[PDB]
Design a protein around this ligand. Structure first.
Ligand code: P9C
Ligand code: P9C
Lengths: 411, 411
């Protein structure tokens, strides 16, 4: 029976370019949302997003290799290097074969897709870059990291839209627990703040259009919420078999004890009022970890700030938590960070792990006036200290009705 | 210890719109390659591909739901309905929660990506379809099928480029074997025969440009080969826990006994001369199934028809097979079908299963003059009868150096 622990963290987010700076900003209630200035937003209903500030990879990726990568890949590689360095793991000929990666994205390389298509429209196919395919496809972050570190173990990339982060991390764990690997770098990366991303989620009526107050736009469970806020970034964890971790004297952030999956089988872009899929995913993670809902002290919600989605998850938590629903803390960091899509569940799993280490839960900012009829504690406005918290639960849900939940355990 | 069997098959390919018609064409050595006529190829170095002929979904998808889906999704849904019907499984309230899907794609919705981007360039973001995101993203085939059949179990989508088919099928099996599900519809779908797909793989110098003889273009291991041939389609299998299958009187095509993964950690778009990654993936599948290379009677190769790729896999087979290398049969159906990318490993896993049922192996057509120095039997030109074949092995490799191998066992 192989246990899986977390021994390395890496991250780029709209509120910090490292794991610790991001976590600190979150506990301080800082918003990373701002007006977009990299493309003309005049014709766009939504003109703001959670952008990665002053992104720097000069020292990690040549400007030469950079030409072959969409920004999402650059972000994922930087976050993965952060996590690999953080873990302190040394790759050897003996080891190589037992270390792999499970890294995905929800939409992949929109920026270079648009650049190559513009080139084709303007000058014909001869203007398409030789790097079109490898610079835009989802699995390219795992591709570059394995090459960079000489990892020859299993490499997969799960693209389950907004649930990708959670699924890649959960399957990395399954892979290790099954015996196919002893270490996996896992998570997700996304850079969808482009004309097609903003225009596309906007065409669907899914984004907040509160342009006059971008930082107040993301407000999960608030009565005035009007859609999600796009966020860019990457989150990466180094997962590792327990005995392997101890043997090398690794620092252990927490243990990954449960992973649950489910499907809504309801609608392509909306959950059922019931939240029955979200509930099933949580129920499965609890069963997988062998614990009762009452043992969870904090739920890092999917909480995207949409009218129907927030309501469904609140119903799901009430259903799974029952009596303890008032005792469990629930918050949505998307209130500050925006929605990282395929990387959401990866950065949020990190927040869930840090909550265990620091015994402190970040708030749902902007929660001025919560929906009526709900007795859940969404940790409005300010961080909250916790006492003897042993388990946290991270949810991620996605278009296509695909859901996932992870459960982390202290020590 | 839960065993996984295959109880349903579905498929659309350039040589047939059903599983049986496709298999028959393959055993007859028929090419499905033709000149492209749906877009003007004047400026294109490659002007042919393996197209799905007379695709029909009128009776499976309304022309209304169709408007919300890229062709790859339409293909995957039709193949998945074929597999679900073939399995004879009945979905109940009791069952729903235990049936899921693992379906992916390598590039996803290129056609609608291009249509929406053209619309944005011509008329601004207001012209982007509300269906842009859900009509192009990778996980949408699993999304629609779960909704269509009321499946509430685990749903994932692996996007590992040209290895997707094999990885989705292997992880569907892991999911069932772990206990997270009793049935999974799994496979891949692709429709990359578009300006960006043909122009994009063409910019990379990876496609054959033998326009004067499209049907002779795909010629794995042949001295005159000059790159892969793009193919469109979908392959889907219904995987199911053994006891669950027997209990309902399911028809069982074969058993899935081994799944191996590996990474080349070499180059983003080319394997090492050594084929050491391909070898490791095969070695891992053999270990997973608990058998020796000598027990395999047929290898459905990745064999894409590129100068470097074919050579590497031939080296890998020689390495893993050793003495038995001359005794094992190896063929590449891409010689006829073209390269289905994310769906390649899914359709090829089907070919691998049918080879067991019929005791017949399809040929590598166009193999007029094999590379020198290789003593492998690539089954040139004509199908071959086999005698007491108990195991087949299917390989799929992809950009990013990601590899996978599956092993199927008779009965
Ligand atoms: C067809 C509609 C209905 C519509 C507008 C479009 C878009 C969406 O479907 C829906 C939204 C905006 C979003 C529902 C939702 O939360 N989907 C969802 C999800 O299922 C999984 C993950 C995520 C994520 O962001 O990771 C996510 O957003 C809503 O609130 C009600 C509203 C709506 C408007 C007017 C009348 C009725 C309903
Ligand atoms: C940088 C280059 C080198 C180049 C041209 C570009 C494209 C590619 O890389 C390579 C090709 C065309 C393809 C190598 C390959 O098989 N990649 C591959 C793979 O790693 C996994 C899966 C698949 C699949 O199709 O599923 C696949 O194609 C070759 O043969 C030699 C040739 C080349 C030309 C001139 C000099 C040296 C080399």
């Amino acid at each position: 029976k192989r246990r899986v622990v977390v021994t390395g963290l890496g991250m780029l987010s709209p509120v910090g370019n490292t794991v610790e700076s991001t976590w600190k900003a979150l506990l301080a209630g800082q918003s990373g949302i701002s007006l977009i200035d990299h493309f003309d937003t005049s014709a766009y209903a939504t003109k703001f997003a959670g952008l990665v500030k002053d992104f720097n990879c000069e020292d990690i990726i040549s400007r030469k290799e950079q030409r072959k990568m969409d920004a999402f890949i650059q972000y994922g590689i930087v976050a993965g290097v952060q996590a690999m360095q953080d873990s302190g793991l040394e790759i050897t000929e003996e080891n190589a074969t037992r270390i792999g990666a499970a890294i995905g994205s929800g939409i992949g390389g929109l920026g270079l897709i648009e650049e190559n298509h513009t080139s084709l429209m303007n000058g014909g196919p001869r203007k398409i870059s030789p790097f079109f395919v490898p610079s835009t496809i989802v699995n390219m972050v795992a591709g570059h990291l394995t090459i960079m570190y000489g990892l020859r173990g299993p490499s997969i990339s799960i693209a389950t839209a907004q649930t990708s982060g959670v699924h890649n991390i959960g399957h990395a764990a399954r892979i290790i627990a099954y015996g196919d690997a002893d270490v996996m770098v896992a998570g997700g990366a996304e850079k969808a703040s482009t004309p097609l991303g903003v225009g596309g989620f906007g065409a669907a009526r899914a984004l907040s259009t509160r342009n006059d107050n971008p930082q107040a736009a993301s407000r999960p469970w608030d009565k005035e919420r009007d859609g999600f806020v796009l966020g860019d970034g990457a989150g990466m964890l180094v997962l590792e078999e327990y005995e392997h971790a101890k043997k090398r004297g690794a620092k252990i952030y927490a243990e990954l004890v449960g992973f649950g999956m489910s499907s809504d089988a309801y609608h392509m872009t909306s959950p059922p009022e019931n939240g029955a899929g979200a509930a099933l995913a949580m129920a499965n993670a609890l069963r997988d970890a062998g614990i009762e809902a009452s043992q969870i002290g904090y739920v890092n919600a999917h909480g995207t700030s949409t009218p129907a989605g927030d309501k469904a998850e609140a119903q799901a938590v009430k259903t799974i938590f029952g009596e303890a629903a008032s005792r469990v803390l629930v918050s949505s960091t998307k209130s500050m960070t925006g929605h990282l899509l395929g990387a959401a569940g990866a950065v949020e799993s990190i927040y869930s792990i840090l909550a265990l280490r620091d015994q402190a839960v970040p708030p749902t900012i902007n929660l001025d006036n919560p929906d009526e009829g709900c007795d859940l504690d969404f940790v409005p406005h300010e961080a909250r200290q916790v006492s003897g918290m042993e388990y946290t639960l991270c949810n991620s849900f996605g278009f296509g009705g695909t859901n996932g939940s992870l459960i982390f355990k202290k020590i």
